[PDB]
């Protein structure tokens, strides 16, 4: 007779739009799902608008995400994102703390806070993003499910964590187009 619970933070894309207007500083750190949605062509758009705005947007790869190596870098490229914006882990992870925004899309075994905060993970130990240490975190995912290594990720029930479910190209071509209305 055992049991554990855990909350979770579902906003609208509305409230996103607030958080991406009123972030100074942004970091989006994509994997597998926008590969599946292909959605690099709306959030391209989308990174485009935002720094004519001032606002520094940069995207955060990690070594092995998405399913072949450098396959993100790949998927920014086609959709014509600045080489100079597309860091690798190593050399944006030390600027998280310093971060207003963080938009999560497709991502999660990246981004996985058990490898730090879990000692009997089986991921205990292995380099991720750091996403959960900006400000605030938007995670776009289609669900709280599992990702490739089929482990929970504690993020989700961070306070400074909010879930923006859903495809994350229909996510995406929303959020690109609301930020046009402005
Ligand atoms: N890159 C290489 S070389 C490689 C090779 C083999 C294995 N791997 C492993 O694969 C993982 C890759 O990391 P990651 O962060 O990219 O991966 P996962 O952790 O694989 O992330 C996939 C996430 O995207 C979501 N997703 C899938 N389709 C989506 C869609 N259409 N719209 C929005 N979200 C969608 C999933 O959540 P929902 O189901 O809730 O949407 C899922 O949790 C690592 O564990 C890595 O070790 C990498």
């Given at each position: 007779?055992?049991?554990?619970?855990?909350?979770?933070?579902?906003?609208?894309?509305?409230?996103?739009?607030?958080?991406?207007?009123?972030?100074?500083?942004?970091?989006?750190?994509?994997?597998?799902?926008?590969?599946?949605?292909?959605?690099?062509?709306?959030?391209?758009?989308?990174?485009?608008?935002?720094?004519?705005?001032?606002?520094?947007?940069?995207?955060?790869?990690?070594?092995?995400?998405?399913?072949?190596?450098?396959?993100?870098?790949?998927?920014?490229?086609?959709?014509?994102?600045?080489?100079?914006?597309?860091?690798e882990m190593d050399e944006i992870n030390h600027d998280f703390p310093d971060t207003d925004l963080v938009l999560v899309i497709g991502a999660n075994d990246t981004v996985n806070s058990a490898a730090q905060?879990?000692?009997?993970?089986?991921?205990?130990?292995?380099?991720?993003?750091?996403?959960?240490?900006?400000?605030?975190?938007?995670?776009?995912?289609?669900?709280?499910?599992?990702?490739?290594?089929?482990?929970?990720?504690?993020?989700?029930?961070?306070?400074?964590?909010?879930?923006?479910?859903?495809?994350?190209?229909?996510?995406?071509?929303?959020?690109?187009?609301?930020?046009?209305?402005?």
């Amino acid at each position: 007779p055992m049991e554990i619970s855990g909350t979770h933070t579902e906003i609208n894309l509305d409230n996103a739009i607030d958080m991406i207007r009123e972030a100074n500083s942004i970091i989006i750190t994509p994997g597998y799902g926008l590969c599946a949605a292909k959605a690099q062509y709306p959030i391209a758009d989308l990174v485009k608008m935002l720094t004519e705005q001032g606002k520094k947007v940069r995207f955060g790869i990690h070594p092995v995400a998405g399913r072949m190596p450098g396959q993100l870098n790949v998927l920014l490229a086609e959709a014509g994102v600045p080489y100079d914006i597309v860091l690798e882990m190593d050399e944006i992870n030390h600027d998280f703390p310093d971060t207003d925004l963080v938009l999560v899309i497709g991502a999660n075994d990246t981004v996985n806070s058990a490898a730090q905060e879990d000692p009997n993970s089986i991921i205990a130990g292995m380099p991720v993003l750091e996403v959960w240490k900006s400000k605030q975190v938007i995670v776009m995912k289609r669900s709280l499910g599992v990702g490739y290594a089929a482990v929970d990720n504690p993020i989700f029930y961070k306070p400074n964590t909010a879930m923006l479910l859903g495809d994350a190209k229909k996510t995406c071509d929303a959020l690109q187009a609301k930020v046009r209305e402005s």
